[PDB]
């Protein structure tokens, strides 16, 4: 999704079945993904998977896990409770850690989608 | 036998239609009522939703959750018969919807 246009964001929310949702934990949430979340919420919720990137917070891993628990709590209160999100680290040579990537691909392999009326 | 519906404290019910749309008096006990299809029995009963201002969240066939009511007094407009209040709609608590924390998905 080109992230500068509700003109696209609305109809992608209409057609999509899975949405993996790209927060950056260095910055917390943003109103672009809040807008997209409400558009999906009103047009009918597709299956949402959180992923939080840019975990180069500091050497302060206490801050890292505190921001991660705030993100997962704000995520659970806003898509269904206990929804799945994956913590991606920094990019290593063009792409992400293949461990978390393989686990993510496993979950979307066993996603088991659902009907919506529209 | 341990409850108003089987033994469960809550039961998912399919809303048929909003009772008392055309009541003129706001916040009236005819207005804050709604027909609901019990699934584990499969039959139609009528139920309350408190705060007819937040009646308008639940509309039609939105798998609401149906709890007990428990009249703790003798209110004036309170009709008898109903003992079912609505506690959630489509998964999310409509009390939380009324104080506008959460959001109703569809």
């Amino acid at each position: 999704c080109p992230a500068d246009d509700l003109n696209a964001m609305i109809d992608i929310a209409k057609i999509a079945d899975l949405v993996l949702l790209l927060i950056d934990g260095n910055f917390g949430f943003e109103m672009e993904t809040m807008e997209f979340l409400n558009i999906a919420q009103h047009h009918g919720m597709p299956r949402v998977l959180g992923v939080a990137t840019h975990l180069d917070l500091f050497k302060s891993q206490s801050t890292l896990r505190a921001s991660k628990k705030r993100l997962k709590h704000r995520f659970w209160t806003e898509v269904y409770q206990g929804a799945k999100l994956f913590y991606l680290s920094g990019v290593i040579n063009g792409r992400y850690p293949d461990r978390e990537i393989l686990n993510l691909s496993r979950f979307i392999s066993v996603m088991k989608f659902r009907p919506l009326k529209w | 036998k341990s409850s108003p519906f089987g033994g469960s404290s809550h039961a998912k019910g399919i809303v048929l239609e909003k009772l008392g749309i055309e009541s003129k008096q706001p916040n009236s006990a005819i207005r804050k009522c709604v027909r609901v299809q019990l699934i584990k029995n499969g039959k139609k009963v009528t139920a309350f939703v408190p705060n007819d201002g937040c009646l308008n969240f639940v509309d039609e066939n939105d798998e609401v959750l149906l709890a007990g009511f428990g009249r703790k007094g003798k209110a004036k407009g309170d009709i008898p018969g109903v003992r079912f209040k609505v506690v959630k709609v489509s998964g999310v608590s409509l009390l939380a919807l009324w104080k506008e924390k959460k959001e109703k998905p569809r």
Partner: peptide, 19 residues
């Protein structure tokens, strides 16, 4: 028990739709 089961079996109740 029946207490931890007769409230949790309502997770199997929904609106009947088709896919």
């Amino acid at each position: 028990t029946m207490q931890r089961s007769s409230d949790v079996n309502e997770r199997k109740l929904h609106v009947p739709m088709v896919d």
